[PDB]
Amino acid sequence: SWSEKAFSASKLDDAIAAKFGSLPIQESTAIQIKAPEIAENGAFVPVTVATSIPGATNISIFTPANFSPMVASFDVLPRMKPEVSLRMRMAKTENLVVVVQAGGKLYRAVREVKV
Amino acid sequence: SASKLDDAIAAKFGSLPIQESTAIQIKAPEIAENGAFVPVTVATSIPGATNISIFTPANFSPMVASFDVLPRMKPEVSLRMRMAKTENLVVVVQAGGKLYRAVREVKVTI
Amino acid sequence: SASKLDDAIAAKFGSLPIQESTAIQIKAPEIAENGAFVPVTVATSIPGATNISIFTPANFSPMVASFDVLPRMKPEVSLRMRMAKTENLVVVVQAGGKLYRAVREVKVTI
Amino acid sequence: SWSEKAFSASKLDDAIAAKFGSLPIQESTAIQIKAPEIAENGAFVPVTVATSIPGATNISIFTPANFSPMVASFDVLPRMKPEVSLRMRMAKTENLVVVVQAGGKLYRAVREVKV
């Protein structure tokens, strides 16, 4: 498990690098993720992501456990109060990782969904 | 007008068959005030949708948003568009190697 | 890449002959820092130019600026572009029923 | 002359309406116009226009005397510190009128160039 967490952390960093490049990243409370705290085994979990970060031009959603870690990417003109919804099947307890690009900077937020 | 829209669509998606579809929902006010921020929501129930894109052919930037998704996620996008003039919102969904489209007009008043 | 650029050009100008031209000047740094605002200046000496347009095919909005002018005004445009990655600036001038183009790359560093 | 000024004022308002529509307009000091105060008869006058207005997506330049009053229009993505230069022949003493569109609002500035 600890080993698994280290490997899935490794996957995530590479996938972010693959998408945005080697951009400095920070944690932000200006990213809102709403999902159920717990959900049923193998069920469709509604997830909603928003950000109030002004120059946000991309919202990308990563699930580091799954075989392909990037699950969705949203390009938008800035200053449009974007909010994005999707439903994802979830077979095991996993962290959703949201990365927002604004300016030349990445902002990160994470939320766990126990299954 | 149609030429410009098709060019924007082609640059995003390439040369794919496009057809109209009622399986794309666009929620917006029928009419809006000049300068007001308009809530817009777009959704689709098309099963193997891997993209949903929003175009405003009347504007300088004809593509407003693009949502790359995995199949079966039933994507929905919501945003606030400031409206200067009457506008058509064009939504295109890619599923397999087909395009699906819906159009909605938002009238603007003085 | 070229397909996308051509589509953007076609949506602005229609179906006109395009040719490369050294009568379009692009001033930009050879290399830039990631996240830095880059000064960019574009000019042309083409006499009957009625438009000069700036494209960045690598970006979400492939058209950055468009300057409609009367002939003989020798338009020049200047702006600051933030750079996230290496980029090609494509400049297109319309004169009569012909298009004229120049390209310049701006490298970006870590 | 007074009559002329009234008619050229009339032309200008119609041309602005033609371009932007019936949008409320105000005067702004956040529009910079640099041109010679005086210039020689029938000569090419270099003119530079900038604006520091944040959401500026269009700069249009009007010369209300001339037969076609709109002389140039500049569309741009916002937040790019645009500055636009041109050279115009000038046969009589005339006002340059710059209108900037940002948001749903027009901002106006004027400068006279004596010939």
Q: Which residue has the tokens 């995995």?
A: B70
Minimum Cα–Cα distance from A77: chain B residue: B64
Integer Cα distance of A85 and B69 in angstroms: 10
Beta bridge partner(s), residue A50: A32, A83
Asked if D84 and C75 come within 8 Å (Cβ–Cβ), the reply is yes
In this structure, are residues D92 and D57 in contact, taking their beta carbons and an 8 Å threshold?
no
Token pair for residue A38? 């717990």
The sign of the torsion formed by the CA atoms of A28, A31, A37, A43 equals negative
Number of H helices, E strands in chain A: 1, 8
A1-115 has which fold?
Immunoglobulin-like (2.60.40)
Collapsing DSSP to helix, strand or coil, D7 comes out as helix
The answer to whether the Cβ–Cβ distance between D86 and C73 falls below 8 Å is yes
What sign does the dihedral D35-D36-D37-D38 (CA atoms) show? negative
- Nearest-angstrom CA–CA distance, D35 and D57: 23
Q: Are A54 and C57 in contact (CB under 8 A)?
A: no
Instruction: Find tokens 């405003």 and name the residue.
Output: B56
User: DSSP strand E in chain C: where?
Assistant: 18-20, 24-27, 31-33, 37-44, 49-55, 63-69, 76-82, 87-95, 98-109
Q: How is residue D68 annotated by DSSP?
A: S
Under an 8 A CB cutoff, do D104 and B34 touch?
Answer: yes
Chain A CA closest to residue C33:
A104
The answer to whether C91 and C24 have CB atoms below 8 angstroms apart is yes
What is the C-alpha end-to-end distance of chain A, expressed in Å? 16
Contacts of A82 in chain B (CB under 8 A): 65, 77-79
In degrees and rounded to multiples of 5, residue B6 shows phi and psi of -60, -40
Phi, psi values for residue A91, rounded to 5°: -90, -25
Burial annotation C47-73 (CB, 10 A radius, 16+ → b, else e): eebbbbbbbbbebebbbbbbbbbbeeb
CA C4, C5, C8, C13: dihedral to nearest 10 degrees?
-140
- Chain B neighbors of A89, CB-CB under 8 A: 72
Architecture of the structural domain at B1-110? Sandwich (2.60)
**Is the Cα torsion angle D70, D72, D78, D80 positive or negative in sign?**
negative
Q: At what angle do helices C2-13 and B2-13 cross, to 10 degrees?
A: 170
SS3 B36: coil
Nearest-CA distance from C34 to chain B in Å?
24
- CA dist A38 and A93 (Å) reads 9
- The answer to whether the beta carbons of residues C28 and C104 sit under 8 Å apart is yes
Q: Which residues of C86-109 are buried (b: 16+ CB within 10 A; e: fewer)?
A: ebebbbbbbbeeebbbbebebebe
Within 10 Å of residue B73's Cβ, how many Cβ atoms?
A: 20
Residues of C in contact with B11 (CB under 8 A): 3-4, 7-8, 11, 62
Separation of alpha carbons A54 and C80, rounded Å: 19
* Beta carbons within 10 angstroms of residue D26's beta carbon: 8
Q: Which of D73, D77, D84 sits opposite C77 (nearest CB)?
A: D84
Amino acid at D4: E
By CA distance, what is B83's nearest residue in D?
A: D104
| Inter-residue contact A29 to A62 (CB < 8 Å) | no
Which helix (H) or strand (E) segment holds residue D8: the answer is helix D2-20
Are the beta carbons of B35 and B80 closer than 8 angstroms?
Answer: no
- Of A54, C62, A76, C61, the residue nearest B65 (C-alpha): A76
Q: What number of helices (H) and strands (E) belong to chain B?
A: 1, 9
In 3D space, the residue among A93, A84, A110 whose CA is nearest the CA of residue A25 turns out to be A110
The span from the CA of D109 to the CA of D57, in Å, is 16
User: Which tokens sit at C75?
Assistant: 């338009």
How far apart, in whole angstroms, are the C-alpha atoms of residue C95 and residue C107? 30
SS3 B53: strand
Say what the alpha-carbon torsion angle C78, C49, B10, D101 is, to the nearest 10 degrees: 50
* Strands of the B24-27 sheet, one edge to the other: A31-34, A44-51, A83-89, B76-82, B37-44, B24-27
Q: b or e along B39-49 (b: 16 or more beta carbons within 10 Å of the residue's beta carbon)?
A: ebebbbebeeb
d(CA B20, CA B91) in angstroms, rounded, equals 10
Write down which chains contact chain B via at least 3 CB pairs under 8 A. Answer: A, C, D
Q: What is the DSSP letter of D114?
A: B
Assess B69–A contact: CB distance below 8 Å, yes or no.
yes
Structure tokens at C87: 């980029």
CA distances from D9 to B35, D4, D13, D22, D66 (A): 26, 8, 6, 16, 12
Nearest to D21 among B36, B82, B85 (CB): B85
Which 3 state secondary structure label does DSSP give C45?
coil
What letter would DSSP give residue A67? S
What's the token pair of residue C106? 């701006």
Four-point Cα dihedral C9, C14, C19, C24, nearest 10: -60
Adjacent-strand bridge partners of B108: B32
Min distance D104 CA to chain C CA atoms (Å): 19
* Residue D47 to chain C, least CA–CA distance (Å): 10
Nearest alpha carbon to residue A106 among A60, A63, A49: A60
Question: Collapsing DSSP states into helix, strand and coil, what is residue D52?
Answer: coil
Query: Is residue C63 a contact partner of residue C32, using CB atoms and an 8 Å limit?
Result: no
β-pairing, B49-55 vs B87-95, is antiparallel
**For residue C72, is it left (φ>0), alpha (ψ between -120 and 50) or beta?**
left
- Alpha helices (H) along chain A: 2-20
Residues 7-46 of C with CB under 8 A from A: 34-36
CA distances from B41 to A44, A54, B53, D31, D37 (A): 21, 20, 12, 36, 52
Q: What angle do CA A95, A101, A105 make, to 5 degrees?
A: 105
This structure was determined by X-ray
Query: Which 3 state secondary structure label does DSSP give A25?
Result: strand
Nearest 5°: phi and psi at D18? Answer: -60, -30
The 8-class DSSP code of residue C7 comes to H
Query: Among candidates B101, B24, B86, B110, which has minimal Cα distance to B55?
Result: B101
Q: Which of chain B's residues have a Cβ under 8 Å away from the Cβ of A75? A: 65-68
Residues A103, C35: C-beta atoms closer than 8 Å: yes
Closest in B60, B61, B84 to D104, CB measured? B84
Enter the tokens of residue D77: 């993505």
Contacts of B110 in chain D (CB under 8 A): 22
CA distance D8 to chain B (A): 26
Compute the distance between CA of residue A94 and CA of residue A75 in angstroms, rounded to an integer.
25
Please name the amino acid found at residue A33: I
- Is A21 exposed, middle or buried, given 0-12, 13-18 or 19+ CB atoms closer than 10 A? middle
Q: Kindly give the residue spans of alpha helices, DSSP state H, lying in chain B.
A: 2-13
